From a paper:
Purifying lipoyl-tagged DEP (Lip-DEP416–511) by size exclusion chromatography (SEC), we observed two main peaks, corresponding to monomers and dimers (discussed later), in addition to a higher mass species. Thus, we crystallized the monomeric and dimeric fractions and determined three structures at 1.84–2.06 Å resolution. Remarkably, each structure exhibits a swapped dimer, regardless of the crystal form: namely, molecule A (turquoise) donates H1 to the H2–H3 core of molecule B (light turquoise) by extending loop 1, and vice versa. Thus, two DEP cores are connected by an extended β sheet, composed of two antiparallel β strands (each made up by a β1β2 tandem) that interact with each other through backbone atoms of residues 442–447. This dimer-specific interface is based on six new hydrogen bonds, which may bias the equilibrium toward the domain-swapped configuration. Interestingly, the solvent-exposed “underside” of the connecting β sheet presents a hydrophobic patch, made up of a triad of hydrophobic amino acids (M443, L445, and I447) located at the DEP finger tip of the monomer. In each crystal, two DEP dimers associate with each other through this hydrophobic patch, thus linking four DEP cores into a cross-shaped tetramer. The hydrodynamic radius of the dimer determined during SEC-MALS confirmed that its shape in solution is larger than a typical globular fold of 44 kDa mass, consistent with the extended configuration of the swapped dimer seen in the crystal. The dimerization defect resulting from mutating E499 and D460 can be rationalized by a striking salt-bridge network between their negatively charged side chains and the guanidinium group of a key arginine (R472). Notably, E499 is located on the loop between β3 and β4, and its salt bridge with R472 appears to be mainly responsible for tucking this loop under the DEP core.
Wnt signalosome assembly relies on reversible head-to-tail polymerization by the N-terminal DIX domain of Dishevelled (Schwarz-Romond et al., 2007), which enables this hub to transduce Wnt signals to cytoplasmic effectors. In addition to DIX, Dishevelled has a PDZ domain (Post-synaptic density protein-95, Disc large tumor suppressor, Zonula occludens-1) and a DEP domain (Dishevelled, Egl-10, and Pleckstrin), separated by long flexible linkers peppered with phosphorylation sites, and also a binding motif for the AP2 clathrin adaptor (Yu et al., 2010). Here, we use structural analysis, as well as biophysical and cell-based assays, to show that the DEP domain of Dishevelled undergoes a conformational switch, from monomeric to swapped dimer, to trigger DIX-dependent polymerization and signaling to β-catenin. This occurs in two steps: binding of monomeric DEP to Frizzled followed by DEP domain swapping triggered by its high local concentration upon Wnt-induced recruitment into clathrin-coated pits.
Numbering used by the authors:
A (entry chain D): 416 to 509
B (entry chain C), D (entry chain A): 415 to 509
C (entry chain B): 415 to 508
């Protein structure tokens, strides 16, 4: 039904139709170059392994959330709540 | 040994930020965007090779996909010109 | 810069494999499998809630779906017992 | 409309399983496997291009990555022969 002889716009319209078989998703992943960034779970891990006084990892997560509230670490996107799957940078440490 | 829950917060943070602290710190971040009906360039190429007659090899279906981008029939999700199988695309104006 | 196309390949790889090399390493991988007519647990829960009368709220549609898995009317694709909306399923022997 | 909590369960399932039932189906699924220290082919190519001098463009860094897979210095996690940026690898025997 379709070939290299078919006009391009018609081929694309067929590809864009319901049930065409094109594999699609409602999410995408993008890589941004940001100097000196770090993953929320990596902060929590570092705290739990290098800072004494956390009985369970849950308490390290809570400290990292405190760090964000104080502006010692900062969100890279417009977000308020602490999250382990988000990326962060250091605050003003002057 | 040396840092505890009793240490000043700024000083902990500055320990974590020093060179050689062990914190995984790198020049990148990954972000999840919700974009309904987006698609990888490799899946366009696969669809074309499987549904459009006359591609002697897969590389010819890749070149045709690049032609779709050039024409505006598909569009990059970010500001980039060259076609790549690893990037995400959406459909252009099909009205 | 200390590495180039003149460096032996084995040494370049041991550099990439070193701690703190820069290379993103994580303890996971995602595998894509072709399985005609598979579906997410959430897609089952949605269909029951929209098409079967008498559920007071969505949670009871979730419990019904878990009942379908117990009965073998739907099946996990991997060896697992607990029903989850995020997992993939196929139909049982009907 | 026709189906309720009083309907036998097998019949509800057969209705859900019929063509045009409205059930969202797919023919691809994604499985997560816990593999220690695995990495994407794309991150290999990014690392090489960023840290190894003498690549005129990124495609030469990819060709180099492919060199590494042939030599067994890196290894596919599933039985695939050719190098792909979208697949996951682990290191080979490094002593």
């Amino acid at each position: 039904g379709l070939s290299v002889h078919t006009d391009m716009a018609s081929v694309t319209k067929a590809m864009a139709a319901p049930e065409s078989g094109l594999e699609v998703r409602d999410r995408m992943w993008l890589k941004i170059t940001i100097p000196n960034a770090f993953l929320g779970s990596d902060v929590v891990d570092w705290l739990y392994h290098h800072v004494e006084g956390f009985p369970e990892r849950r308490e390290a997560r809570k400290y990292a959330s405190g760090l964000l509230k104080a502006g010692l670490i900062r969100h890279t996107v417009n977000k308020i709540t602490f999250s382990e799957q988000c990326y962060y940078v250091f605050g003003d440490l002057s």
